[PDB]
Amino acid sequence: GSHMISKINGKLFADMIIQGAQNLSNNADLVDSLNVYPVPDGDTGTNMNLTMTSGREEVENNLSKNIGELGKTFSKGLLMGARGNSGVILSQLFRGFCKNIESESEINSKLLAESFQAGVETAYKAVMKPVEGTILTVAKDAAQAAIEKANNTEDCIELMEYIIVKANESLENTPNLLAVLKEVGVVDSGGKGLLCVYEGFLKALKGEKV
Ligand SMILES: Nc1ncnc2c1ncn2[C@@H]1O[C@H](COP(=O)(O)O)[C@@H](O)[C@H]1O
Ligand SMILES: [Mg+2]
Ligand SMILES: [Mg+2]
Ligand SMILES: [Mg+2]
């Protein structure tokens, strides 16, 4: 090819973390305005923004080209600053993601998809009473799409684009699973914040800045 991404090293992953955190920060007020579940306290964007900034600050201060070591730095940053339901779940999604790659220097598209799925498994186990129509649902559907696409797609850019398309479809379907979302007329705020991070991931894979 030419401008495709076959492997993601530690600096590329740091770029996805930085641009994902920056895109979430740029949309934090919108994600806040959507927060009606479980308590309508309008803080999901702030909670996820503060959680991801903790991971972002750790990464920016301890860069590595070894993705497994970078992932440890990122994971610890999120886990020691996780705020609210959404930040806790976000830190657990990426705890499982980063644990899956801890011994790797770089990962390919199939390991990337597997890592999204590993994060979903970690997060569902961490939440005592998981509820559908939420950030868990969006993460689960995005991981299912990643795994299906990666078996025939070596380009991590094309994979991330497909992940985003199907995560968007899952997010738009969250009101059909969670009554309060349909009754108020909004998608899930936690899932919207997660999509904001995933869109930053794609920007970084394309060598772009948010
Ligand atoms: N029991 C649960 N299962 C799955 N997701 C949840 C649960 N409780 C809260 N959430 C997510 O957390 C978001 C709100 O986070 P926060 O405003 O930080 O409490 C919701 O929109 C959901 O996506
Ligand atoms: Mg609050
Ligand atoms: Mg809230
Ligand atoms: Mg480019």
Author numbering: -2 to 207
What's the publication's text?
Fatty acid kinase (Fak) is a two-component enzyme that generates acyl-phosphate for phospholipid synthesis. Fak consists of a kinase domain protein (FakA) that phosphorylates a fatty acid enveloped by a fatty acid binding protein (FakB). We find FakA consists of three independently folded domains. The N-terminal domain (FakA_N) is the ATP binding component, the central domain (FakA_L) encodes the dimerization function along with a Cys-His-His catalytic triad, and the C-terminal domain (FakA_C) functions to bind the FakB substrate.
The FakA_N structure has a simple architecture comprising 11 α-helices arranged in an up/down barrel configuration. Located at the end of the helical barrel, the adenine is partially buried in FakA_N by the loop that connects helices α2 and α3 and to a lesser extent by the short helices α9 and α10. FakA_N is structurally similar to DhaL, the ADP-binding protein of the Dha kinases suggesting an evolutionary and functional relationship between the two proteins. Another difference is that DhaL has three aspartates (Asp35, Asp35, and Asp37) involved in chelating the two Mg2+, whereas in FakA_N, there are only two (Asp38 and Asp40) with the third Mg2+ interaction coming from Asn32. The FakA double mutant (D38A and D40A) does not complement the ΔfakA phenotype confirming that these residues are important for catalysis.
